[PDB]
Amino acid sequence: GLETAGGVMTKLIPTKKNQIFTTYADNQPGVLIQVYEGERAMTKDNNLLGKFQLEGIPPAPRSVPQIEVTFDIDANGILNVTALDKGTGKQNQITITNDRLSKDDIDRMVNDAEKYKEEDEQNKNRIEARNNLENYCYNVKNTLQDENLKTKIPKDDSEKCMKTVKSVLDWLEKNQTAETEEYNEKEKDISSVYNPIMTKIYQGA
C-alpha cells in the first residue's frame, strides 16, 4: 500500500488494483506518493520501497481533486505504481523490481503483525479521530460563512460558535498529536454549540 494523511498505511500472486485519493490541503500543488510494504498496519513500521511526487496539480479545495493510483503486479512480482490526475490527465509512475527478504524474515514479519497489529488497529482509530475533527472544523466554519442565504441564523449564536471553532483550530495546530478522547472532547464541545443551531433551523414548521 501507500501512506495517507496521518502516516497511515492504506493497503491496495498476479493482481492489479486501484484507489482514488484527494488533496490534504487547499491549493496543494503536488502529492507525494510513499510506498510502504508490510504486515503491520502502520506506514512507519513498514519499509519504504520508493517515493515519488506528482507535480502540476491545479489549485483547488481540500477534497476536490481526484487522483487514481493503480498498482500493477504480474506473475514476476515487479510492482508498477502509477498516480494519475483525473482532471488534468497528468501522471507519474515508478517501477520497483522483484530482485531480497528471506522466508523466515517474511514469516517473522507476518507473526509480528498478528501480535502487534492488534495495538495498530487502536492507533489507527486514534489517528482517524484527528482527521475527522479537522474536517468537522472546516465544514462548520464553511457552513457559518458559506451560504449568504444562510445568514438567517442569529448573529449571537454564530459569533459564539465561530469563536469555539477558532479556539479548536488553534488547539489543533499547537497539539499536533493528542489522545483520542481529547479530540472527541473537542468535537463534542463544538457539537454542543452547533447542534442547537441546526435543530432551530429545522425546528420551524
For residue 35, give the nearest of 65, 9, 62 by alpha carbon: 9
For residue 17, give the nearest of 62, 66, 82, 65 by alpha carbon: 82
Q: How far is the CB of 147 from other proteins (least distance, A)?
A: 25
Interface stretch with other proteins, choices 30-38, 96-104, 168-176, 184-192 (CB under 8 A): 30-38
Segment 55 to 114, residues that bind other proteins, using CB under 8 A: 62-63, 67
Three-state secondary structure of 57-68: CCCCCCCCCCEE
At 193, is the secondary structure helix, strand, or coil? helix
Residue 24 within binding range of other proteins, rule CB under 8 A: yes
Residue placing its CB nearer to other proteins in the complex, 139 or 195: 139
Residue with cell 503483525: 113
Interface stretch with other proteins, choices 1-9, 117-125, 163-171, 195-203 (CB under 8 A): 1-9
Interface stretch with other proteins, choices 21-29, 71-79, 115-123, 163-171 (CB under 8 A): 21-29
14-40 core/surface letters (b: 16 or more CB in 10 A; e: else): eeeeeeebebeeeebeebebbbbbbbb
Site string for other proteins, 131-160 (x = CB under 8 A): x-----------------------------
Q: How far is the CB of 5 from other proteins (least distance, A)?
A: 4
Q: Which three cell numbers stand for residue 156?
A: 449571537
Q: Interface with other proteins by CB under 8 A: which residues?
A: 3-5, 21-25, 28-33, 53, 62-63, 67, 131
